């Protein structure tokens, strides 16, 4: 039903990781570049269709109100596997740091640790699949 301010800020963060040049819109090329960097290989037709399905005003790019509309209207395991680079079933701080700088983000050590702590339920200082799933659900 509702959308909290925390939920909107998370969708806004996600939008900004796709919006590589920070101009307020996501193009097919920015989408393509991000998806390839995370191991996917969309065709040009798929990228154009994906943008078109979200582009409600038809100007050919995605702004945040359109992105918010799709996210409010809408595989956590495949995402877990992006973060868990060595595949041992536990996301370490080092793996999270690495995943975040490959996204172009600037983080301190304390910041990465704060993110581990936020997801860490049992307190072993890592993030397992069940904790990952509970973060997103």
């Amino acid at each position: 039903d509702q959308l909290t301010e925390e939920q909107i800020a998370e969708f806004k963060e996600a939008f900004s990781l796709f919006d590589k040049d920070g101009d307020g819109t996501i193009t097919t090329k920015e989408l393509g570049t991000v998806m390839r960097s995370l191991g996917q290989n969309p065709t040009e037709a798929e990228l154009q269709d994906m943008i078109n399905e979200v582009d409600a005003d038809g100007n050919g790019t995605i702004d945040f109100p359109e992105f918010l509309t799709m996210m409010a209207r809408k595989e956590i395991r495949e995402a877990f596997r992006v973060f868990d680079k060595d595949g041992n079933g536990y996301i370490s701080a080092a793996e999270l740091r690495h995943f975040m700088t490959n996204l172009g983000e600037k983080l301190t050590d304390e910041e990465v640790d704060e993110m581990i702590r936020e997801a860490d339920i049992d307190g072993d200082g890592q993030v397992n699949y069940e904790e990952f799933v509970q973060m997103m659900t």
């Binding site: 969708f11 963060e13 996600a14 991000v34 995370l38 996917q40 595989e75 956590i76 910041e111 936020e118």
Partner: peptide, 19 residues
């Protein structure tokens, strides 16, 4: 710094990018 926003925002991008 909002640790939950930064982490969940990055996970939601991965979920979208891997469809």
């Amino acid at each position: 710094f909002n640790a939950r926003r930064k982490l969940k925002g990055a996970i939601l991008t991965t979920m979208l990018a891997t469809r």
